From a paper:
In Neisseria gonorrhoeae, the best-characterized and most clinically important multidrug efflux system is the multiple transferrable resistance (MtrCDE) tripartite efflux pump, a member of the widely distributed resistance-nodulation-cell division (RND) superfamily in Gram-negative bacteria. N. gonorrhoeae MtrD contains multidrug binding sites and a proton relay network that generates the proton motive force (PMF) essential for drug expulsion from the bacterial cell. Based on the cryo-EM structures of MtrDCR103-CASP, MtrDCR103-Col, and MtrDCR103-LL, we observed that MtrDCR103 employs different binding modes to anchor linear and cyclic peptides.
We synthesized an all-α-helical peptide (LL) that contains 16 amino acids of LL-37 (residues 17 to 32). Similar to the procedure used to create the MtrDCR103-CASP and MtrDCR103-Col complexes, we incubated 2 μM the MtrDCR103-nanodisc sample with 50 μM LL for 2 h to form the MtrDCR103-LL complex. We then obtained a cryo-EM map of this complex at a 2.89-Å resolution. Again, within the binding protomer of MtrDCR103, the cryo-EM images depict an additional large density corresponding to the bound α-helical LL peptide located inside the open cleft of the periplasmic domain. Our cryo-EM structure indicates that the bound LL peptide occupies spaces that form the entrance, proximal, and distal drug binding sites, where this α-helical peptide spans both the binding and extrusion tunnels of the MtrDCR103 pump. These residues include H46, I48, S81, D83, S85, S87, S89, S116, Y125, T128, S130, S134, R174, F176, E271, D272, S274, S275, M570, F610, F612, S615, M621, F623, V662, P664, P665, L668, E669, N672, and R767. In particular, D83 forms a salt bridge and S87 form a hydrogen bond with the LL peptide.
Author numbering:
A (entry chain D): 17 to 32
B (entry chain B): 1 to 1040
C (entry chain A): 147 to 243
D (entry chain C): 50 to 146
E (entry chain A): 292 to 340
F (entry chain C): 874 to 922
């Protein structure tokens, strides 16, 4: 589940 | 062609019926979503290596994977990211026109080559290759306030997730919660009491919980006479906590049988414990639904909601479902806006047509023709494989007006001929079409020529332009084809002859309006004659206007898209390094209450564990869902105002840590397109300290001694934090039996979790994890109390062979294109073009010694390429327009008189934008208009319309001179003849764009941008054109 | 610089850049990147009564990557305010080591 | 190996089948599991769907989902085939020696 | 590569090498004494003439 | 069958500039249907006997 979290925060990192 | 169909109305009707059928069929089979795909393909890796630091993760996993990725077809650039969370990722970006599926399969096949060279635990967990593209549709939340998050996550995974992904149009469902697991919490004190180790626990668990494969009786190579065969089955796996607690760790000779349940506590738990989510302050379980390519967003969202409503019946007491965000609402609103604008345009066209042509059957032709042209555009859009989304719907809205003109022109010309010569409608239609057919063909050719360039741009901006370009071009082409076939047939059939000898001696309103408009037309002709008599002065005035307009256009800000009120705000919370999850949760509760204090906020979703900066126990973020746009119309109830209020409250309330509220860019998949993003590479592998020092030097050079708006220049990582460093004496450890690998296993099971085996839990396999009791891993002094076995098998504490001290280490590491890198951000100071700032930073990076390079990221990679493509495309467009007009007029010099109207529209647009910016500044509102994509689209639209009007005027003027009139007389007569249709179309188009000028609500920023540009450009351009186009004709004839 | 150093520099800096170029199918270095080479003398092994497998096992057991973990990890007792990352080297990086 | 048809179906085949929804041009799916710890998932696509694109997409999804499947399946992997079930010919070899 | 172009690939390799030369250790240079695209370009030029 | 009839109607109307001549033509399709159905039924009966 760390991988799903990694995906969500990578997207968020990009926006701001 | 027009003459052919004037005598065959039923053939034209049949063709139009086929067009309507094709359009309906195309609409039936179009994907529906709020936005199309504009970003390039990207593949990510997402490996898990538990219990590791950024340096360990990077060097042991991410570099190893990265080194085997140079060679995949169509790779643009590549990056890595590692943090202290025990997980990392490798991101591969690809050149456009690369098949994402092929890229993903090739990346997976490359990973399969080096998978065996990774650490054993990495291979145990596996590496997930996926594509960054996400067609996000909804969030589904389950809230109980009674049962824990473990229960809700299990219930979701077992009941809700499988039901949602069986729905039509669903491409993927993702659960934002950890699965269940069997957790063993070992007390190291008891372990040392029995002289056991974590390795013993793991070995016993793996040996006593394993699948058995027995076989069958009487297998094929059987003895003679065998009559029965049977499958033999034995169960060798455990399924309950009581069963797991009875695992034998040491079978003593006396028969004591030290069990697993007297050194550890065994119970069902989760597998992460990292992230927590809440909705308005209560525990929740979130799910994300992603639409499939070729799926309909509205239908899928409705079906999902129906399914959830049905399933709600079986929820445990206290559990409820809610969907706080949905993207299908935006496209639904866009389609509703399209329909409303179409109805309003039809009504307005009817009103003006009846006011001018003084009959009701004249109003019937535009009503029939315009929807058919739109349907033909829809059919073309379906044929090309596009979809219905916000941009295509905006393109429809904007092309409605020009397709309306294409019919107003023909109807007005026919009505003029009929009222003038008194001919019957058939003869009048024949005459009018013989007059205007070639002009129509040339106009459609020019419109295609001007719109094709917008489909030739590169990148995400090109993808965005392609929507408008293709939709509008198809609609224009179909409108022209219909004006050449069906409009003349309708004119010749449905109209009735004007009573011969009638001078329109009307009564009441009609007579009065006729007289007043005739006076206006006469006054207009007098003013045009005055303008024509003195030509040098008017040419000087025109050059002045063109120069001023060009100057205004240049001095406009550059941007991509304007931020839009999408209905939510984001909050990012960051606490001092080393803070724990408890303090972060307290701060999140404070933020939740503050959001509650704001009426504009409907729901607040807070997630603990990671932030905008990154992951960590001190990181957190929140999503604030705003009320409906209808409920938020007064000043200060927009997304920016809500974000400002929340930020102001947070800066005064929160004690430990800080929070910031912002609104995201209009397109989430496409990152922020503002600022200057810098990657500072280390070519020589000097070290982290050297690269950090160089980054600090570059930041100083940019801020103190540069032109970058010093405020925004800052690093985009996460500063170093104190860490605990264990130093082991080789000699001391060798003196005892410690082997440095028993140390590895002991630490990996003590200070971090260990994944040992797998068990069945009511039908699905779930992990077994050994993590050690929390009381033995809280303080630094606990590290040296851990024990590791010797060769003889005795336990020896780490204190004897090791020491621990506080040090400074990296919290996060990133590589770019195979070198250690740092990330930086920036923004131009003021009135500074991005190009010179980029040259400046390149020079500064050069000032640093060799071994340190530079690389642009994100939008800066595209912005590095010059703007020569746009200039070249518009130059080619102008050349093509010139050639087409020369073919139309059979001249080389006449086309010039039509090109001189381009500055008029440009000046109108630029002046309108500048004036509205200044007015909003006076009102106190910050500027919101720039030279963005929507400005370019609107400029192209108004420029095409002005070109159409000029072409018609010049065509009429040229023919009159050929008959015998002088140039000046011909120009006067052409202006007098074209006055009425131009007034009609300008009125209709301007008032039809007015609603986009005062737009407010969903996607209203782009609406307002287009409205401003189009409205002001059209008004000013038409006002100047109706006076200057005859001047252009006269001058061009005199000169040549 | 000798051919060994240049070969290593090529493998680490030039080859990836070249094989990231469009139209390239494969890059072959007429050489190899560096490695830690142990050159064993069997006579000395006889003198000390050792074996090749002994050398291999000792190298494997004393040069590995250690993942320590963290302090105050996510499931924590009440009142925990300090979190940290633990680190241990466990790996050799020079010929003398 | 060692799993009943029910366990094989609920732990491996069902997981893959559920994640196979949303693949372009899919008509229907079926699974078959057996007492001997072997199983299979069959995906049928509409005609006018080319086998190669469907192959690539199905395999991408399978790789995406394999991250959780059981350990022994991951050891043996999952095989892929796309050939006609019906026979074209039967070739016979006979000998008396 | 299968479906690769010799001339374009050689030009890209040479440009990339020229760019990378800026980071070399001191005393290190680069050459391409063997190159099959030179014959192609010269022959094409001669036929054009 | 519906699309076949509609296509015939539209093509005839475009060919002859009328809405009634194609209507007269379409009246013959029931005769063909009756013939075909009667033939199939009759051959079935004859073979059964
Ligand atoms: C879709 C197809 C619709 C049905 C055919 C449309 C064209 C019919 C042309 C019939 C015709 O004789 O008109 C002449 C040829 O048209 C022409 O101008 C040349 C043929 C044009 C074919 C256009 C076909 C659709 C194009 C869609 C864009 C007029 O032209 P003329 O100058 O020869 O006058 C000679 C006058 N007896
Ligand atoms: C005075 C002159 C007036 C002229 C006449 C008035 C103007 C008419 C204007 C409207 C245009 C005519 C109506 C067209 C409506 C669009 C129909 C599109 C339907 C669609 O998209 O499919 O094989 C293929 C698909 C195969 C499977 C789907 C088949 C579905 C069955 C269809 C049966 C119904 C249609 C055929 C029989 C009516
Ligand atoms: C008049 C003929 C149309 C000419 C202009 C049409 C503009 C609006 C078309 C509808 C649109 O943009 O999206 C559609 C929504 O459906 C609808 O909006 C259907 C309701 C309104 C149909 C006509 C609206 C008056 C214009 C397709 O979206 P979809 O995929 O859901 O539809 C197919 C489901 N089989
Ligand atoms: C009856 C309704 C039929 C609706 C669908 C008609 C589709 C006919 C086949 C396409 C004919 C070529 C038209 C054209 O401009 O080329 C297109 C590409 O052009 C471009 O991509 C750039 C220009 C695109 C806008 C051009 C709009 C023309 C719309 C048709 C006007 C007809 C007016 C009525 C006579 C498609 O060509 P392709 O096969 O190469 O596809 C390329 C896909 N990547
Ligand atoms: C945007 C493109 C702007 C290009 C403007 C070129 C205008 C050249 C007009 C010069 C001129 O005097 O017109 C004709 C000269 O023939 C000529 O030789 C004109 C030059 C040849 C033009 C070729 C254009 C190719 C453009 C490709 C780029 C003769 O005047 P006239 O007889 O036609 O008019 C009635 C005059 N009494
Ligand atoms: C089964 C195949 C049916 C094909 C379509 C049948 C339509 C029959 C209309 C016949 C009307 C009677 C003739 C008449 O003149 O009245 O009238 C008038 O002036 C208006 C007549 C308009 C008839 C338009 C028929 C378009 C059919 C489009 C189908 C899609
Ligand atoms: C679908 C059926 C469409 C048939 C429409 C009737 C066309 C008849 C024109 C004709 O009678 O020829 C007179 C002019 O010759 C001509 O030259 C007429 C040329 C008209 C070309 C139309 C080509 C067919 C378009 C659809 C096939």
């Amino acid at each position: 589940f760390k991988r799903i979290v990694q995906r969500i925060k990578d997207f968020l990192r990009n926006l701001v | 062609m027009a003459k052919f169909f004037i005598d065959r109305p039923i053939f034209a009707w049949v063709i139009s019926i086929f067009i309507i059928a094709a359009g309906i069929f195309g609409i039936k089979s179009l994907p529906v979503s709020q936005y199309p795909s504009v970003a390039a393909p990207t593949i990510t890796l997402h490996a898990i290596y538990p219990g590791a630091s950024a340096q360990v993760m990077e060097g042991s996993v991410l570099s190893v994977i990265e080194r085997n990725m140079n060679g995949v077809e169509g790779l643009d650039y590549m990056s890595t990211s590692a943090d202290s969370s025990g997980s990392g990722s490798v991101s591969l970006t690809f050149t456009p026109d690369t098949d994402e599926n092929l890229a993903q399969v090739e990346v997976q096949n490359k990973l399969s080559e080096v998978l065996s060279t990774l650490p054993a635990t990495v291979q145990q967990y596996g590496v997930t290759v996926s594509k960054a593209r996400s067609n996000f549709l909804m969030i589904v939340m389950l809230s109980s306030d009674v049962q824990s998050t473990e229960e809700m996550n299990d219930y979701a995974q077992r009941n809700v997730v499988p039901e949602l992904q069986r729905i039509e149009g669903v491409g993927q469902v993702r659960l934002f919660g950890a699965q269940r697991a069997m957790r063993i919490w070992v007390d190291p004190k008891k372990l040392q009491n029995y002289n056991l180790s974590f390795a013993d626990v793991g070995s016993a668990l793996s040996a006593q919980n394993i699948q058995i494969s027995a076989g069958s009786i009487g297998s094929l190579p059987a003895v003679r006479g065998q009559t029965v065969t049977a499958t033999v089955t034995a169960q060798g796996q455990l399924g309950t906590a009581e069963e797991f607690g009875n695992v034998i760790l040491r079978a003593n000779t006396d028969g004591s049988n030290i069990y697993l349940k007297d050194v550890a506590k065994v119970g069902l738990g989760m597998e992460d414990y990292s992230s927590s989510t809440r909705l308005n302050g209560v525990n929740t379980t979130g799910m994300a639904v992603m639409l499939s390519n070729s799926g309909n967003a509205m239908a899928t969202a409705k079906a999902v909601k129906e399914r959830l409503a049905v399933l709600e019946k079986y929820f445990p007491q206290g559990m409820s479902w809610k969907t706080p965000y949905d993207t299908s609402k935006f496209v639904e609103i866009s389609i509703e806006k399209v329909i409303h604008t179409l109805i309003e345009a039809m009504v307005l066209v009817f009103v003006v047509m009846y006011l001018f042509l003084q009959n009701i059957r004249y109003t019937l032709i535009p009503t029939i023709v315009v929807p058919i042209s739109l349907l033909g555009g829809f059919a073309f859009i379906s044929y090309m494989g596009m979809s219905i989304n916000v941009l295509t719907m905006f393109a429809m809205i904007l092309v409605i007006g020009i397709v309306v003109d294409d019919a107003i022109v023909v109807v007005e010309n026919v009505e003029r001929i009929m009222a003038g010569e008194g001919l019957p409608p058939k003869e009048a239609t024949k005459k009018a079409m013989g007059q205007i057919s070639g002009a129509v063909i040339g106009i459609t050719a020019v419109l295609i020529s001007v719109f094709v360039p917008l489909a030739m741009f590169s990148g995400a901006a090109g993808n965005i332009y392609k929507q408008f370009a293709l939709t509008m071009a198809s609609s224009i082409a179909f409108s022209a084809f219909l004006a050449l076939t069906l409009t003349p047939a309708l004119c010749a059939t449905m109209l009735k002859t004007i009573p011969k000898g009638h001078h329109e001696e009307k009564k009441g309103f009609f007579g009065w309006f006729n007289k007043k408009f005739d006076s206006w037309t006469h006054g207009y002709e007098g003013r045009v004659a005055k303008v024509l008599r003195k030509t040098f002065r008017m040419m000087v005035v025109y050059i002045g206007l063109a120069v001023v307009g060009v100057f205004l256009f240049m001095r406009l800000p550059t941007s991509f898209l304007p931020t839009e009120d999408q209905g939510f705000v984001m909050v990012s919370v960051q606490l001092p390094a080393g803070a724990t999850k408890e303090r972060t949760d307290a701060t999140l509760a404070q933020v939740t209450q503050l959001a509650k204090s704001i009426p504009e906020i409907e729901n607040i979703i807070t997630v603990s564990g990671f932030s905008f900066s990154g992951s960590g126990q001190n990181m957190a973020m929140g999503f604030a869902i705003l009320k409906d746009w209808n409920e938020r119309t007064a000043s200060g109830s927009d997304a920016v105002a809500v974000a400002g209020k929340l930020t102001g409250m947070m800066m005064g309330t929160l004690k430990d840590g800080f929070g910031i509220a912002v609104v995201p860019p209009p397109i989430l998949e496409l990152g922020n397109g503002s600022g200057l993003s810098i990657n500072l590479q280390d070519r020589n592998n000097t070290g982290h300290t050297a690269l950090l020092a160089k980054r600090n030097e570059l930041i100083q050079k940019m801020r103190a001694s540069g032109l970058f708006d010093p405020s925004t220049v800052r690093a985009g990582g996460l500063e170093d934090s104190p860490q605990l460093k264990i130093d082991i004496n080789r000699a001391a450890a060798a003196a005892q039996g410690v082997s440095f690998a028993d140390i590895r296993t002991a630490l990996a099971s003590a200070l971090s979790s260990s994944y040992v085996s797998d068990f069945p839990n009511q039908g699905r396999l779930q992990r077994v994890m050994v993590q050690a009791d929390g009381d033995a891993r809280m303080q630094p002094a606990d590290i040296l109390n851990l024990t590791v076995p010797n060769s003889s098998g005795i336990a020896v504490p780490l204190s004897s062979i090791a020491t621990v001290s506080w040090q400074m280490g990296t919290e996060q590491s990133v590589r770019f294109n195979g070198y250690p890198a740092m990330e930086l951000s920036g923004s131009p100071a003021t009135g500074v073009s991005t190009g010179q700032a980029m040259e400046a930073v390149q020079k500064m990076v050069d000032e640093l010694g060799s071994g340190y390079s530079l690389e642009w990221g994100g939008q800066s990679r595209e912005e590095a390429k010059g703007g020569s493509q746009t200039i070249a495309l518009y130059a080619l467009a102008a050349v093509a327009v010139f050639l087409v007009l020369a073919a139309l007029y059979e001249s080389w010099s006449i086309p010039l008189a039509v090109l001189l109207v381009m500055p008029l529209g440009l000046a109108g647009a630029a002046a309108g934008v500048t004036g509205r910016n200044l007015f909003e500044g006076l009102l106190g509102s910050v500027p919101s208009f720039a030279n963005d994509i929507y400005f370019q689209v609107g400029f192209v639209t108004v420029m095409g319309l002005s070109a159409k009007n000029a072409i018609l005027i010049i065509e009429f003027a040229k023919d009159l001179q050929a008959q015998g009139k002088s140039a000046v007389e011909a120009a006067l007569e052409a202006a007098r003849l074209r006055f009425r249709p131009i007034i009609m179309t300008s009125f209709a188009f301007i008032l039809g764009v007015v609603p986009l000028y005062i737009a407010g609500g969903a996607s209203s920023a782009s609406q307002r941008a287009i409205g401003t540009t189009v409205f002001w450009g059209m008004l000013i351009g038409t006002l100047l054109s109706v006076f200057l186009v005859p001047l252009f004709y006269v001058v061009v004839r005199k000169f040549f």
